[PDB]
C-alpha cells in the first residue's frame, strides 16, 4: 500500500494558513 | 501615547498566537518525516 | 518616552516580517516532503 | 506608563527568543529531509 | 545490498527540543504581557 | 529519474536565513 503522510502534511498546511491570517490581523492592529 | 501602548499589546498578543500555530505546523512536519523514515525502514 | 514606543513598533513590525519568513520556509518543507512521498509511491 | 513600556520590551524580547528556536528547528528539518533524499539516491 | 537502516533521528530530536523550548518561551511571553 | 527536492530545501534555507537577519535587526532596534 501507498506511503501517505497526507494527514500530517494537510494539518501543517492548515496551521500555516491560520498563522498567515493571524499575522495579517497583527500587522492591521499595528497600522491603526 | 497610552493608545499606542494598548495597540502594541493587542498586536503582540495576536503575534504570539501566529507563532504558536507555526510551532504546531513544525510538530506535524516532524511526524510526517518520521512517517517516511519508518515506511522505508519498516 | 515616545522614542521607546516608536522602537517597540519598529521592533514588532520587523519581528512580524521574520515570522512571515519562517512561515514560507514551512510551505517549502511541506512541498519537499510531498515530493519525497510522490517519488517513493510513483 | 514606563512599567507598561518595559513590560512590552520584556514580552517582545521573549517572543524573539521563541521565534529563533522555531527557526533552528526549521534548520534541523532541512537536514532530516536532505538525509532521506540521500538514503534513497544512495 | 543496504548496509545501514535510515536514521535522521538525531536531526528530528534536536527539532523536537527546539519546538518544546519555543513553547515554554511563548508561555513566558504571554505570562509577561498579562502583567 | 533521481529524487531531487533540492529547490524546496534551498528556498527553505534562504527563507530561514532571511528570518535570522530580520531577528537580529529587531533585537538591535530594541537595544537602541
UniProtKB/Swiss-Prot annotation, chains B, C, D:
Coiled-coil parts of chain: 1-24
UniProt-recorded name of the protein: Fusion glycoprotein F1
Organism: Measles virus (strain Edmonston) (MeV)
First-to-last residue of the parent protein present: 143 to 184 of 550
